[PDB]
């Protein structure tokens, strides 16, 4: 097979990881109360 020429690499910098995690965690801190209801 021919190596598909439409692919690019993917990236996520350190800050984005942090900004990411902060969002996930706080959302969890916000919705957990309603999940346990």
């Amino acid at each position: 097979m021919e190596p598909n020429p439409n692919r690019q690499p993917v990236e996520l910098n350190r800050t984005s990881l942090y900004l990411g995690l902060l969002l996930i965690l706080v959302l969890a801190l916000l919705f957990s109360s309603y999940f346990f209801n």
Binding site: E2, N4, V10, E11, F35
Partner: protein, 490 residues
């Protein structure tokens, strides 16, 4: 390289892997359908279609399967409550089975189309580079759609070569799958007439077949092809989404307001039926009729079919409930067992009182009793210090007619107040709270959930449209701008 939220752009012009992608998607949606069914079949109780129907057991997929014919199980039972019936292969199990397989096949297909992405069919003879002639495709697809649309209305809904669809009386008591004859008259545009759902698919189907051919032949006017940046697939998206959310906002409305497409015996009552005391009026009408034909109050009320009384209970109003009040309606008030009967309240003077019902808006509501003219005669006081209408001071009593408590009367204040406290919700019923370990807090019906989910998705999809649309008409200025300083001078 690519940001996380762009990883899928790797397909913007790779028709092969784009098909490989949509194949996998379709596989998952078909897969979900099959397996969500099995989940319902493993937990749905057919033991009683009257007081414990699918819409009380938090069933979501099971109704959509009945609306088009499938109303039986290989195990013998059936949605309408009949026995000895032979659903054939197309039973709920069957449907569920089918989807699971169709998913497996679409999977394998998705795989093949991924590895063999560079088929020539996607390369333009002229430019020798990947390309898809959108305008002609749309014509093709649209032709197939209308062709299938036609068939669905023509053979399925009509019964010609199919089952039909769900049809019921004005008070969901007789409902079932029946062949529906078309309706091209004016009343065929009435949401509550089945004939309209048939005619539509035949008419729209044909128009769809016609319109399709046109687009397979006539080409897009230069002006347009330029304007609506055709030959650029990321615009087919912008338009599709706009249609998809349009469709969405509509199904959300027909589910909430009701239509021949969302029958109460499959999705539950409507909040507006409770608002206008819909079922309350049908009951009275019947009861007063029985009294005319010389029946006693006992006989009159006893004639009222349980199912009919059940719809006249606020615990089936989709407007009651909460966002995180999960599960079936049964985890709320409990599994309905029987109708205790109509409660008639009277005071020492013999006068008949009436319990002011609970408006959907109110989580909690006070117990107030008035006569025919609406004069407050009795109530349950907050501050007893100066209560003038306490059930005690008024000698309020309660009597029942037809049902569990039929022929009985209760006069001890506590017991009287208990039922009065219950009358507020309409017809009083007997629930089994044990089984599901209910908490006694109202939950909404599938009608309610479907309506909420789709009203949201739609409003969310609008943003998708506005986003993708923009990104198509501004592809050039994407990544940024450049030079000059013109502005304020034509």
């Amino acid at each position: 390289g690519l940001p996380w939220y762009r990883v899928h752009t790797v397909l913007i012009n790779d028709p092969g892997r784009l098909i490989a992608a949509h194949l996998m998607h379709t596989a998952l949606v078909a897969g979900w359908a099959g397996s969500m069914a099995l989940y319902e079949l493993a937990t749905f109780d057919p033991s009683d279609p009257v007081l414990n129907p699918m819409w009380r057991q938090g069933m979501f997929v099971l109704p959509f399967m009945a609306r088009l014919g499938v109303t039986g199980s290989w195990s013998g039972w059936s949605i309408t409550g009949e026995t000895g019936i032979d659903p054939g292969f197309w039973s709920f199990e069957g449907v569920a089975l089918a989807h699971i397989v169709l998913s497996g096949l679409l999977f394998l297909a998705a795989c093949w189309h991924w590895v063999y992405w560079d088929l020539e069919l996607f390369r333009d003879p002229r430019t020798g580079e990947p390309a898809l002639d959108l305008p002609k495709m749309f014509g093709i697809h649209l032709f197939l759609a209308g062709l299938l649309c036609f068939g669905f209305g023509a053979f399925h809904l009509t019964g010609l070569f199919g089952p039909g669809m769900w049809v019921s009386d004005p008070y969901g008591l007789t409902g079932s799958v029946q062949p529906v004859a078309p309706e091209w008259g004016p009343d065929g545009f009435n949401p509550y007439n089945p004939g309209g759902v048939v005619a539509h698919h035949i008419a729209a189907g044909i128009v769809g077949i016609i319109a399709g051919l046109f687009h397979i032949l006539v080409r897009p006017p230069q002006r347009l092809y330029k304007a609506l940046r055709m030959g650029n697939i990321e615009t087919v998206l912008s338009s599709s989404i706009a249609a998809v959310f349009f469709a969405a906002f509509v199904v959300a409305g027909t589910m909430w307001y009701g239509s021949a497409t969302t029958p109460i015996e499959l999705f539950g009552p409507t909040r507006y039926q409770w608002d206008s005391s819909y079922f309350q009026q049908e009951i009275n009408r019947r009861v007063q009729a029985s009294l005319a034909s010389g029946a006693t109050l006992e006989e009159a009320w006893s004639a009222i079919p349980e199912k009919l009384a059940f719809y006249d209970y606020i615990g089936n109003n989709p407007a009651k409930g909460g966002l995180f009040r999960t599960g079936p309606m049964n985890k709320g008030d409990g599994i309905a067992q029987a109708w205790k009967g109509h409660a008639v309240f009277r005071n020492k003077e013999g006068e008949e009182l009436f319990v002011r019902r609970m408006p959907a808006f109110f989580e909690s509501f006070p117990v107030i009793l008035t006569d025919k003219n609406g004069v407050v005669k009795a109530d349950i006081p907050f501050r007893r210090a100066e209560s003038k209408y306490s059930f005690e001071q008024q000698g309020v009593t309660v009597s029942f007619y037809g049902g569990e408590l039929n022929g009985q009367t209760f006069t001890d204040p506590p017991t009287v107040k208990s039922y009065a406290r219950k009358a507020i919700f309409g017809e009083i019923f007997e629930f089994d709270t044990e089984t599901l370990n209910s908490d006694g807090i109202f939950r909404t019906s599938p009608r309610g959930w479907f309506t909420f989910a789709h009203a949201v998705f739609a409003l969310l999809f609008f943003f998708g449209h506005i986003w993708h649309g923009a990104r198509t008409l501004f592809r050039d200025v994407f990544s940024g701008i450049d030079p000059e300083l013109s502005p304020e001078q034509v």
